[PDB]
Design a protein around this ligand. Structure first.
Ligand SMILES: [Fe+3]
Ligand SMILES: [Fe+3]
Ligand SMILES: [Fe+3]
Ligand SMILES: [Fe+3]
Ligand SMILES: [Fe+3]
Ligand SMILES: [Fe+3]
Ligand SMILES: [Fe+3]
Ligand SMILES: [Fe+3]
Ligand SMILES: [Fe+3]
Ligand SMILES: [Fe+3]
Ligand SMILES: [Fe+3]
Ligand SMILES: [Fe+3]
Ligand SMILES: [Fe+3]
Ligand SMILES: [Fe+3]
Ligand SMILES: [Fe+3]
Ligand SMILES: [Fe+3]
Ligand SMILES: [Fe+3]
Ligand SMILES: [Fe+3]
Ligand SMILES: [Fe+3]
Ligand SMILES: [Fe+3]
Ligand SMILES: [Fe+3]
Ligand SMILES: [Fe+3]
Ligand SMILES: [Fe+3]
Ligand SMILES: [Fe+3]
Ligand SMILES: [Fe+3]
Ligand SMILES: [Fe+3]
Ligand SMILES: [Fe+3]
Ligand SMILES: [Fe+3]
Ligand SMILES: [Fe+3]
Ligand SMILES: [Fe+3]
Ligand SMILES: [Fe+3]
Ligand SMILES: [Fe+3]
Ligand SMILES: [Fe+3]
Ligand SMILES: [Fe+3]
Ligand SMILES: [Fe+3]
Ligand SMILES: [Fe+3]
Ligand SMILES: [Fe+3]
Ligand SMILES: [Fe+3]
Ligand SMILES: [Fe+3]
Ligand SMILES: [Fe+3]
Ligand SMILES: [Fe+3]
Ligand SMILES: [Fe+3]
Ligand SMILES: [Fe+3]
Ligand SMILES: [Fe+3]
Ligand SMILES: [Fe+3]
Ligand SMILES: [Fe+3]
Ligand SMILES: [Fe+3]
Ligand SMILES: [Fe+3]
Ligand SMILES: [Fe+3]
Ligand SMILES: [Fe+3]
Ligand SMILES: [Fe+3]
Ligand SMILES: [Fe+3]
Ligand SMILES: [Fe+3]
Ligand SMILES: [Fe+3]
Ligand SMILES: [Fe+3]
Ligand SMILES: [Fe+3]
Ligand SMILES: [Fe+3]
Ligand SMILES: [Fe+3]
Ligand SMILES: [Fe+3]
Ligand SMILES: [Fe+3]
Lengths: 169, 169, 169, 169, 169, 169
């Protein structure tokens, strides 16, 4: 039952990606409230930051304790330019979540190639959460194409942050 | 993360199959009560009709909203002959549920072939429900080989419609 | 007390109309959320879909069991073009509900002509629901002529889906 | 939808393995309390015995009823030597649980090779439980390398037997 | 207070008998539901399986811890032919329970011959349970001579599995 | 009321320090459980990780929104060697917390030098928490000099994680 190093590397890559995204979203959340005057967009993006820096990384760390994989902490991230407006800000979040889906797809494919069925099982959470997170983010993007009034949008976002689909969680 | 057209077509096929089955079962339910004098068989088959026309189709439609697949509504179904008796009626329902299992198997196989792990994830509900639905239907078929008394059978069916296995739901 | 074949045919026609409308509205609901970014319009139209495919058809089927009329299931419907925008989408729903009112009027007229007072009684539900459904749909159409802001409209629709008039139900 | 004989054989093999493990653990539990003076280690290993002889075998039997596979009961097991001490005893349990993981891996691999997606679905419980059970057993092994005092260890085990991870159950 | 080896051997024999019966009944329970279409007969026989594999063996193991007797686990059982019908199936269970009564009788007789009053005390549970278990099994056998309708019988069995006589438990 | 750039820089430095410490402690927590077999030490250090990555950074970000200071996210941290044992691990945590106290001292001194009384006010939380956090960490270090038994220590840590001093919180 010897652990796959290929899977170990990919999952450490995914760990690093969730830590670094989490830190970028913490910054985007600050900017959404502060410079863009959209504190509810900030709270939405702050919850996403805490999701990435919480269970997304905790499950990988927990998974490693169980199977002998080694955890690596190597983290480099700098927020050097901000998107120009809130619409572009949430559009940026969307692009990164879309890449999350691509990365976890590669992990599932690898686990099947490695006959690592425990790792294929484990990744199903991330396969599901990739679409869930993307959908939540997409729900906000749509608002910026439905109203020119940032207070209208803000009020809608607040109802969104104040439930689990049977399949997608 | 570009959506698979092969999967899009198969899942629209599966959508159409659940709508049309749902309409056939609505009719079989009417016949079970009306002509066959078995209103509890009718209620069992009516619940199956509402299952097919409800979540079985709603999840596909919901899945498409999330990933960019397009929904197609093209529906042709006519109930042109009725099975001759209730035993043959529920035996017919069984045959169609057995084909449900075959169709969702092809969808899972395709998703792996396409490296569409979100679609493989999504189909697991249908992989599981194929056996669940078949088992519930099989529970009724067995009654018609255990008693010659339609009122005995009817009473057993009523207890069946008045719970979730850990694995099969 | 021999059942009217004219009434039997009209009521099977009405059954087919409610199944097919129900399937068209299921599609319109998907489009309202997905392409038009109006998930509450979608929920309104989805509830209308489940109304048409539920009691509107169940009462006819139930009525037939009681009086000897035969149920026919013959269903052909394809959603081949979508209205161009949400206003046109809900305007389309309105046009179809207006035809519902015309069809049930013809059924009441026929029942009186046939001295089928049980069928005149039974149709009173549909006479009443024709106006009820049309009014609910009209309440939404009016929103699209009162605001240019789809998020404003969406918020109003949500309060509408979150009561029974003494006469019109 | 004809059931796979290869899968049928493997799953009967797995059934036999869970019955026989269950009987070996029942014995190890007795020895842990009686000869090793560690009644809480006994209760931990007794719960593992009842797990193996309960749902681990019941799900396979239940799965067979649903799909047409045949159940085989052929059981030979004799506990002919006992490990020399409690540390070696729980280390032995660990080795057997590690082989459980290897056996269920082969079953998942086979189901994909057979395009038996219902059997791949069904085995996911066992894929997950292989790691869960191994982790619980590993939690105890670690105690024997952290203390030389069997009463210290025993007290820790008792808190362990007096919760479900989101992924691993 | 030196423990009797004759009693030790007989009680290890009885332990082995309860494990092996338990495994045979687990199989008979599966067959009752699956092939004979009698899931309530299955639940009755499954409860009997868990009784034999539970307290019937746990008390012997517990008794040994207290008095110095050694536990032996040596188990060989294969279900190589199934009775032809449900009546014969439950009739078979009856025959085996009748032999349980004969075996525990020999154990009580031995304990008196050995002046092992703790073992005579301990066996009184098994003396009592031999008749209890036989009576419960006999209650089901009688059903197969009172009705030709397996659904009638099944309904009666279900009320039987959904209380303790003052003497026989 | 023009914001101090010196204070802005120091507080961005402190922000970066709390993010990076938080990530180092997340790793140390994993190692404490996994390699050192001390899951309660892990939970203690994991809570410290979430403290540093939570309110310690959120208050700085919140403070900046209020006064016009700019937030900078620039994060580089790699866990390249692990301390050799748990005692050294928690001793390392202690050393870093002791430097926290030194850094916040410099911030208070600067705020008085700048006549930034809002920043002197704001830092009082961090002045207080520097000692609080150090005391909690010191409570654990002491355990490693009071017992040679890692299970004894582990049990004490668990009571520690299962209250607010009037002055130090
Ligand atoms: Fe990644
Ligand atoms: Fe604010
Ligand atoms: Fe969330
Ligand atoms: Fe590790
Ligand atoms: Fe803006
Ligand atoms: Fe392979
Ligand atoms: Fe997430
Ligand atoms: Fe408003
Ligand atoms: Fe509001
Ligand atoms: Fe509100
Ligand atoms: Fe299909
Ligand atoms: Fe009825
Ligand atoms: Fe159901
Ligand atoms: Fe769409
Ligand atoms: Fe019939
Ligand atoms: Fe491939
Ligand atoms: Fe279903
Ligand atoms: Fe009855
Ligand atoms: Fe009854
Ligand atoms: Fe009843
Ligand atoms: Fe009842
Ligand atoms: Fe009509
Ligand atoms: Fe939505
Ligand atoms: Fe309504
Ligand atoms: Fe009829
Ligand atoms: Fe629109
Ligand atoms: Fe007239
Ligand atoms: Fe209506
Ligand atoms: Fe409002
Ligand atoms: Fe409101
Ligand atoms: Fe409100
Ligand atoms: Fe096996
Ligand atoms: Fe004890
Ligand atoms: Fe357990
Ligand atoms: Fe079977
Ligand atoms: Fe020992
Ligand atoms: Fe293949
Ligand atoms: Fe288990
Ligand atoms: Fe203690
Ligand atoms: Fe305690
Ligand atoms: Fe306690
Ligand atoms: Fe015996
Ligand atoms: Fe069953
Ligand atoms: Fe009992
Ligand atoms: Fe012993
Ligand atoms: Fe039979
Ligand atoms: Fe004597
Ligand atoms: Fe018993
Ligand atoms: Fe009853
Ligand atoms: Fe009753
Ligand atoms: Fe600092
Ligand atoms: Fe742990
Ligand atoms: Fe704290
Ligand atoms: Fe700012
Ligand atoms: Fe250590
Ligand atoms: Fe001064
Ligand atoms: Fe703190
Ligand atoms: Fe204690
Ligand atoms: Fe305690
Ligand atoms: Fe305590």
């Amino acid at each position: 039952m010897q652990k796959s190093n290929k899977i170990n590397d990919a999952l450490n890559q995914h760990y690093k990606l969730n830590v670094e995204l989490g830190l970028v979203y913490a910054h985007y959340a600050h900017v959404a409230d502060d410079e863009f005057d959209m504190p509810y967009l900030g709270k939405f993006i702050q919850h996403l930051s805490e999701d990435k820096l919480g269970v997304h990384k905790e499950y990988i760390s927990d998974y490693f304790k169980r199977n002998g994989m080694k955890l690596k902490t190597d983290v480099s991230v700098a927020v050097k330019s901000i998107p120009s407006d809130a619409k572009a800000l949430i559009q940026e979040v969307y692009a990164r979540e879309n890449e999350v889906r691509d990365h976890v797809k590669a992990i599932a494919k690898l686990a099947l190639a490695e006959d690592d069925y425990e790792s294929f099982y484990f990744i199903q959470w991330y396969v599901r959460d990739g679409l869930k997170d993307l959908t939540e983010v997409d729900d906000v993007v749509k608002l910026f194409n439905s109203s020119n009034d940032k207070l209208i949008i803000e009020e809608t976002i607040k109802e969104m942050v104040e439930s689990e689909h049977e399949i997608w969680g």
